[PDB]
């Protein structure tokens, strides 16, 4: 059966009953429906005191067409977690609503390791990303409501970074003209919309540590810049405040549950490229202080993702992972060999040692941030039995790392319980101090060198003039110390998406940087950037329906 | 004190206690916290066949500056209703989101009669403006996407009559050019946003039955015209199903309590103007089916709301309101005798009596459709012992009408037994058959000339050249037989909003149409529309924020 | 003058939804009816709705024909009002130094145009506005 067949014969525990396994009372929970609740705000300051358990964290290998699952070790895990003793918490992002309607959703998960209930994560789960849309598009209507009203701050229409957002896949308003049709309307400008979860609002969602430093940071975003050049705060646009409010609700995390009824928060929903790809700080904080393991996962491969959850997330917020898995398929790496993607039964040992090259990279990257690793192999019946036990015998022979078969897609709990031994030794082993990538009073341009030439194996970084000048403009302004968040493919450690496994030499060049001080990082982005996607000649919605018992099908 | 103090200071019952007041198991409730619950859809299936109670439509005079309490009337009587026996439930509209940060929000009712809770009602609620947009905001991508990948339709740039929305106050986005920055963007066209509640969905959504109702009315909606001015529906794009799915949970209506735990429902919300001004179909046929009074009301006056909520809602549903209450105040009338807002508080022979006109033209509009009245005159400690004596002579003689004084507001339901007492009498007595204004099988001509000739006190309508133009369209197109919705000032009876009172003579000049194909209504414009509206220049936004304890300032 | 003016400094604090001034060229061209202009970023200037009418219909060219002199023509154009300010005080052709420059522009076309009828006889063709937003009538130079 398809994932979502699974998800629909299962039945879900009544979420005070997950909330209990985490010592939450039911007087504790905003029910939304009989299995979603939200975990209150006064319940959550309550835990300032108590101590953190295990952090785990989740990133993969270089994404392939072919697919890794990471996101089904991150359930797995954590089911297995539970299974061999441990109470254990997963914690994960919502997806965007508007990408269900171009192509198809997609379970939290996949088989047998999944968070329910689907169709809800998938579209409205409990308003988040709608909460997020109206601060952000209040913010949008006060900025162009100030210039309407005798322009007092002197804002440069031409100068304004601020743009609009909503949670569809509409290309219509990538770039738009706007307060057109007379003096009533107001001052013509250019603007565009990204979708909701590309708003520097979702990063700061995800990094804010409670309500008190939302505001903090929100005021901190700088939408646009005066005549004369000097910047323009959401705090002088008088936003803050109402913004705050709109995500009072939205701020407090989703308790949720897998197919075996193991507790899991899913909570915020950020880029990987413009944005560190984390779920919220508020959401892993939660889990660490009410469970003997956290398992969390990083948007894209562990060159992206991970860095950014150590050189972003786990910097701003003092967190340290116990021990970090990276997810890998044999399909992947055999993609990485240089096998197209119908070539993939056929045994090729050959093309397995080539694309070893992509993993043997992440691993010794993460080892370089002093952190344990173990390797989560994803099975899959195609597989040869030859072909898992030369990744075995190469991650000991190179990489002194072990390689754990995981058969949780179909096996559940189970078929992560070797993975979840494995991970509680690496926590229970020698703790070793959590190094970053740079030092933070370097400047950007050698953060930006540190990442390029030590984990991406770039020969050097150019800087093009338009981002040489912001970057002066940066440093000059007093942003200088800022942590770096890298935007480029996330399909190659170099910004050739085609340059598979792991090439040495390349040159990174960043055409532009963006400033994000709510997150309180510096954007550098190295290729084309996608912010709003299209939909295709036949988007799923033409087949998106109701059927006569009033199912939903063609979402799955 | 003020209402949100009063709001706040209450004990709320957990909801499941009011559910049971109308006999719905906890096993039918989808929770949003523990004060809100949405009916389950199953649950409102089986109650099709089970026979209905009596329906209270409660309507008032002519808005003024002054206020006339019309939502504390409809919360009092229902409580009132309770108080005496009679098993009765409130149906109300959910406020916009956008205003709340323009002006300030407000209390569902107000006083001791109000539904609660007062910041979910005036926020996100249960985010069914929320999955509105996101319908809305679909099919926008889907028109968009159809003309980028071939226009197989033939769609014409220059007349797409759909546009987009969002729920805020945003002038910026009345007049927009959309598609633009190169190739991948697509065509330039000329575009605007509405607030989301101009939305012809939510019109769609006030008045579907069911599922299979909401999809049919979706799919009729006419969103563009073809360059050989074929017209084309959200059919032809295979937007409906999709619209549908987003808008599932939403139309499950939303119950509430008052602050004396009697069972409240609000679901829908669309204008009065360029709408039919009521609450949703679903919620006031679920009412009648679990309660033996069921009391909803709809915006504006009775020349507006009561006509619409009559000739559109009853007319297109089936359904009779067994007695109407037409809300009156004496600083109104007073305003509608030429008093000026400011000079209210002195008592005032006459100003009454020639604004009693306003009150004796609603009265005699409502009994014309064959409907019992009853003239609730909510008290304020402002009026004399003679001038609510007065109003019940003028009542007495000119009309054969009860005039009965309503202290609702600060006694609570005890200060509207009285009202119910005569609501009782009335729904149980004569019961003659629902008239219409106008009948079906007429010109949409005859349909205005009529409304404003029978009702508006008009002595006729002019039809300018771009408004019978479209007329001629509509009635060739096979739209001929549909029902009219006069979008028109509501401070008076004429499309001036200056002649307060009951003005004769005057004419209704109609300047343009718009067909709502799916809601099933032809709107008719006379004065100028805002579809979009704009924040002031000290928008409430600016003061609205959290206390040092967590608590919203600002947003009453 | 007017765009480059309000891409500088706006010292004169012209107001872009009050200018008044439209642009020309001589050719029937519906596309230019209604432009929004000034747009690709900062270096472009500030966007403002805009729009083309045919040269005949130009106050420069009346003027044209209502000039006794080169002098007079350039008083006349100093005095054309192109825009608002913010606080609603209006604009003109000098306020933006636009007057000397246009009337060396038009100088050598300030002298009538002398040719001949089919048999020979003398004829002044100069000038020519529309009759509805204009007077349409030739020069009086001529």
Redesign the interface.
């Known amino acids: 059966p398809s994932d979502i067949e699974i998800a629909r014969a299962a039945t879900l525990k009544p979420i005070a009953q997950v909330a209990e396994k985490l010592g939450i009372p039911d007087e504790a929970l905003?029910?939304?429906?009989?299995h979603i609740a939200?975990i209150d705000?006064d319940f959550i300051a309550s835990l300032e005191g108590k101590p953190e358990g295990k952090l785990v964290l989740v990133t993969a290998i270089s994404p392939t067409p072919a697919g890794e699952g990471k996101t089904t070790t991150t359930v797995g895990l954590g089911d297995a977690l539970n299974r061999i003793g441990k109470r254990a918490v997963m914690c994960l992002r919502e997806p965007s609503?508007g990408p269900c309607?171009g192509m198809k959703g997609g379970a939290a998960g996949g088989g047998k390791a999944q968070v329910v209930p689907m169709e809800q994560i998938n579209?409205?789960f409990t308003?988040d990303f709608?909460?997020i849309?109206?601060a952000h598009?209040?913010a949008?209507?006060?900025i162009?409501?100030h210039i309407?009203?005798?322009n007092e701050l002197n804002i440069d229409?031409?100068?304004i970074h601020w743009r609009r957002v909503?949670?569809?896949?509409?290309?219509?308003?990538?770039?738009?003209?706007?307060?057109?049709?007379?003096?009533?309307?107001?001052?013509?400008?250019?603007?565009?919309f990204d979708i909701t979860v590309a708003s520097e609002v979702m990063a700061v969602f995800c990094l804010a540590k409670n309500?008190a430093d939302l505001?903090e940071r929100l005021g901190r975003i700088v939408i646009a810049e005066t005549?004369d050049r000097k910047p323009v705060t959401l705090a002088d646009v008088?936003?803050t405040?109402?913004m705050?409010?709109?995500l009072?609700?939205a701020l407090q995390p989703n308790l949720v549950q897998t197919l075996e009824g193991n507790p899991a928060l899913i909570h915020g929903g950020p880029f990987a490229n413009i944005a560190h790809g984390c779920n919220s700080v508020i959401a892993t904080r939660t889990g660490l202080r009410l469970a003997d393991y956290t398992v969390t996962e990083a948007g894209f491969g562990a060159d992206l993702g991970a860095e950014k959850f150590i050189d972003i997330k786990c910097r701003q917020t003092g967190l340290k992972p116990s021990s970090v898995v990276i997810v890998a398929t044999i399909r992947a790496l055999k993609m990485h060999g240089g096998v197209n993607k119908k070539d993939l039964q056929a045994e090729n040992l050959d093309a397995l040692e080539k694309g070893f090259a992509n993993l043997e990279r992440h691993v010794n990257n993460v080892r370089s941030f002093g952190l344990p690793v173990v390797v989560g192999v994803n099975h899959f019946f195609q597989d040869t039995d030859a072909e898992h036990a030369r990744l075995k015998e190469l991650c000991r022979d190179r990489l002194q790392v072990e390689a754990i078969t995981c058969k949780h897609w179909a096996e559940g709990g189970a078929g992560a319980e070797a993975l979840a031994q494995a991970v509680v030794k690496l926590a229970e082993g020698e703790q070793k101090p959590l190094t970053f990538a740079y030092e933070t009073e370097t400047k950007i341009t050698d953060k930006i060198k540190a990442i390029a030439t030590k984990l991406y194996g770039a020969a050097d970084i150019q800087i093009e003039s338009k981002a040489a000048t912001k970057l002066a403009g940066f440093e000059k302004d007093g942003y200088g110390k800022l942590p770096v968040c890298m935007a480029k493919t996330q399909y190659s450690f170099s910004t050739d998406p085609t340059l598979m496994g792991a090439p040495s030499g390349h040159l990174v060049s960043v055409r532009d940087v963006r400033l994000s001080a709510g997150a309180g990082f510096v954007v550098v982005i190295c290729g084309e950037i996608m912010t709003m996607p299209?939909?295709p000649?036949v988007?799923?919605?033409?087949?998106?329906?109701?059927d006569a018992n009033?199912q939903?099908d063609?979402?799955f």
Chains 1, 2 share one sequence.
């Open positions: 905003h029910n939304y429906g009989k939200k705000h609503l309607f579209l409205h308003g709608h909460a849309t109206s598009s209040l949008a209507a006060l162009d409501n309407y009203w005798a229409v031409r100068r909503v949670d569809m896949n509409d290309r219509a308003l990538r770039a738009i003209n706007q307060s057109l049709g007379g003096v009533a309307n107001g001052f013509p400008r250019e603007d565009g309500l505001e005549r008088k936003a405040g109402a705050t409010v709109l009072k609700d299209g939909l000649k988007p799923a919605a033409d087949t998106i329906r109701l009033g939903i063609g979402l």
